[PDB]
Amino acid sequence: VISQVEAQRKILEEAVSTALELASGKSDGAEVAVSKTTGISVSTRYGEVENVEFNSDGALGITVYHQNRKGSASSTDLSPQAIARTVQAALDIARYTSPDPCAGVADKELLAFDAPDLDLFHPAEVSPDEAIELAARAEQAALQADKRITNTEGGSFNSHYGVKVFGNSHGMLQGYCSTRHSLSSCVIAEENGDMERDYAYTIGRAMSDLQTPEWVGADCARRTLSRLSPRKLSTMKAPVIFANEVATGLFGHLVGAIAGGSVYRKSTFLLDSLGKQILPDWLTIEEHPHLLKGLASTPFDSEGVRTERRDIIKDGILTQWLLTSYSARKLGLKSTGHAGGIHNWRIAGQGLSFEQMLKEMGTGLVVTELMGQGVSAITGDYSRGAAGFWVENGEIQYPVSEITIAGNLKDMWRNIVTVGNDIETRSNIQCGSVLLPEMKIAGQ
């Protein structure tokens, strides 16, 4: 596989050089990205192979600039002739677009000319038959857990490697390799004329960082069985815990609200909040783009800009926007290396377990799953479908579904009571469960 990957890497590097050279005579600047992803995706049904999918995807993207006019083109064909056509397409477009001085290649002084090795590449030679056996093991462990499990949506195993190369007309040309492997199962349980489905999974850059198939199956069944016989709450106001998985998404809404694109367009409810307290004064959000093997580690952003260790929130204070080249120029600032998103967020727990948070809350709603969109970028208004558990006397009483929770993110974030030690570790943003003092719950 490493001979295959090194061969792909050389091909991609030449493709970037070729595109940049073809552009150089007819543009003031150009940026070129190429990627290749290869691997396998398999599923099982009742422990037998269902699907075997062989994946092989490639792509080349180019943006060129002339008189501050921009044009872009892309192709999945990396032959020299296809590259020539893609370059000419982008150049032709830039004859019709308008001069826009905030457009252009990222600032030379911010580029990752010598990009760090973040050890993202841990390939595995997994045959389809071996992949199938892993999926089957996870699914069978789920199906054997309890006699109320009566159907399946299957086991699934995925293993891929990727090569990405970026270059631009300031002389940057840097590339890196990565791997991702994952294993999941999803089953259906029934009780008293009600069906429920849930899943469990494990993910990592190295095969030896995964949970066992049998762990996945046990987790899948536990989650699925816990959903049985839900109640629809009556309409009320109560405290709400966002369980760790959805709590990561609660902090996730911050990304849109502090993105430079939203800020310069005045389309964020946090427009006037830079340097002000938006979160509790003990809460810090640490960004760590250079974690070795990190799930969202990156040696540079999508415009080739260096990434840095940053405290996005420090002691409840919003310290910075998330800027790209274009939005930074619009605001008179410099890129913070956030083209393409955020790069590993970490929020520490304040010392309580999940069980202790339930005791602290006493009576209230725990949300474990949210449905729908219902979050306004410009106002912060929040209205989402929810499922979870009702808590009374500090103990889970029954599952709940067919309800909504509503409020405003500005209020929700400012008034967080505590964050748990039960940290979710499979995601970009990693935190524990989050206690909110009050939300409007719509139901019966």
């Binding site: 049904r45 037998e48 269902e50 699907n51 075997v52 999918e53 062989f54 092989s56 995807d57 490639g58 921009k70 044009g71 872009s72 083109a73 892309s74 192709s75 999945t76 064909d77 893609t86 397409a89 477009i93 830039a94 019709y96 677009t97 308008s98 826009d100 457009a103 389809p128 159907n151 949506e153 009600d194 069906m195 429920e196 489905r197 959903r227 839900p230 309409t235 367009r265 389309s267 449905m371 729908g372 969109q373 219902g374 410009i378 106002t379 208004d381 209205s383 989402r384 479908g385 499922a387 579904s401 067919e402 309800i403 909504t404 509503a406 409020g407 719950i441 719509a442 139901g443 019966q444």
Partner: protein
């Protein structure tokens, strides 16, 4: 028809009909029920205006072949981002390994049959000049800004695709399509006394960009849509808190048809029902909606975003009655699930591209009109919501819970529409909510050409539709 696509996809890439025979033969060396070869090329453009200038433009090209081998429940799948004999051979040889056992090698002779055309074969990317395309956007910007002094920002985009497909299969299917699709999107920001809000409009379909300059009720369509985005932004700017709880909800005609897409649409896709994982599994012949409700999925509609002259397996699009006077009639199928359920293809076998597997997917999903006027429906509510527009939604087909979120909504008080209210997510159970439909309007319309549907990571263009209707009890996710 087939000829033109076959020259572009096969002949231009050094392939003939007999190469198709040979590759399908390679698949049939194993013990399969079915195998297919799916050829595609597509060309996508987009242009974006913001801050009164043309900021961005893009041109995107894709091409490839996907090859499937199917045996009962099982699919092997491989593909390549090129159209060549070697790509075909490599793909077929990988995909057939789904089963180890030898097959009888029997395949039906390849034979194309006529289908009805549903949209032009003229390339929309080439049929209008770039200067005229960009003038559509400039017009949108000018009209929006002239509509109200509070308009501070307008983003307007034009997006077009031209797509050629050819499918050849072991059951003798040989079919081709030429698929145009265009979309105009408008978003506006309004400001008053330091408060800001946004509004949006747009649509399109399977035709050229000239559609945006044609007449809509006595005005130029793009002017009308520019004005609509401004109107929506101004409604939202004035909106007050929505009420929380269970109440009557009156849904407008058209895009509020998202109701159907979420509450029944996905639940009636044959893959979920074959597996027994949908709440509708085994329920054919039962009352799954009020007796006032007839719900169809219709791939035959001339020029529409959601239509399929052929689906991605070569099956001509069909008018499929799913629910008739409240009674479940059947499911949307692809070839695989049809065989496994002992049913027949319905024209719902769709894939995002050559690089993805087809499955049962919606086309244009709507409710047939009834006898009530929209005014009668509004007048019947003492206290509730009127919601003439929505964003998107979501459904859990197993537990039968679904949501959809309002983008324009109002209180109804004493049978009159009163105060505009803020965006709220509405939640219910699919079958139970459909059973609460007590009034069905005489004013059926489909959406303007905006639908995007997701399933298993695959995005597709869809349509939805309905008349004005009344749900007697639905949970509204307000704060007040």
């Amino acid at each position: 028809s087939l000829n033109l696509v076959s020259e572009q996809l096969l002949a231009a890439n050094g392939l003939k009909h007999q190469d198709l025979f040979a590759i399908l033969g390679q698949l049939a060396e194993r013990r399969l029920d079915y195998g297919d070869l799916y050829f595609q090329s597509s060309y996508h453009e987009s242009w974006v205006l913001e801050d009164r200038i043309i900021k961005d433009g893009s041109y995107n090209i894709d091409q490839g072949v996907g090859v499937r081998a199917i045996s009962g429940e099982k699919t092997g799948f491989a593909y390549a981002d090129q159209i060549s004999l070697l790509a075909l051979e490599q793909s077929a040889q990988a995909a057939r390994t789904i089963v180890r056992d030898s097959g009888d090698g029997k395949v039906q002779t390849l034979g194309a049959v006529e289908h009805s055309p549903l949209y032009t074969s003229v390339d929309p990317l080439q049929s209008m000049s770039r200067e005229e395309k960009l003038d559509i956007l400039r017009r949108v910007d000018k009209v929006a800004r002239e509509a109200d002094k509070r308009v501070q920002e307008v983003t307007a985009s034009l997006s077009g695709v031209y797509e050629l497909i050819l499918v050849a299969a072991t059951d003798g299917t040989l079919a081709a399509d030429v698929r145009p699709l265009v979309r105009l999107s408008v978003s506006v920001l309004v400001e008053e006394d330091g408060k800001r809000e946004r509004g949006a409009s747009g649509g399109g379909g399977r035709f050229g960009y000239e559609f945006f300059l044609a007449d809509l009720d006595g005005e130029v369509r793009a002017d009308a849509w520019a004005k609509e985005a401004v109107r929506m932004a101004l409604v939202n700017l004035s909106a007050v808190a929505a009420p929380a709880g269970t109440m009557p909800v009156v849904l407008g005609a058209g895009w509020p048809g998202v109701l159907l897409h979420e509450a029944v649409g996905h639940g009636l896709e044959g893959d979920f029902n074959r597996r027994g994982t949908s709440v509708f599994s085994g329920q054919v012949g039962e009352l799954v909606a009020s007796e006032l409700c007839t719900v169809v999925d219709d791939g035959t509609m001339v020029d529409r975003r959601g239509s399929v002259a052929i689906d991605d397996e070569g099956t001509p699009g069909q008018y499929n009655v799913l629910i008739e006077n409240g009674i479940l009639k059947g499911y949307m199928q692809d070839k695989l699930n049809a065989r496994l359920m002992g049913m027949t293809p319905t024209g719902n076998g769709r894939r995002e591209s050559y690089a993805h597997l087809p499955m049962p997917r919606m086309t244009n999903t709507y409710m047939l009109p009834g006898k009530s006027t929209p005014q009668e429906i509004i007048e019947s509510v003492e206290y509730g919501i009127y919601a003439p527009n929505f964003g998107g939604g979501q459904v859990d087909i197993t537990s039968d819970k679904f949501v959809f979120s309002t983008s324009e909504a109002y209180l109804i008080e004493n049978g009159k529409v009163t105060k505009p209210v803020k965006g709220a997510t509405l939640i219910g159970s699919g079958i139970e909510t459909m059973q609460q439909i007590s009034m069905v309007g005489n004013d059926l319309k489909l959406d303007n050409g905006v639908g995007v549907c997701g399933k298993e990571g695959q995005s597709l263009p869809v349509g939805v539709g309905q008349p004005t209707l009344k749900v007697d009890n639905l949970t509204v996710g307000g704060t007040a």
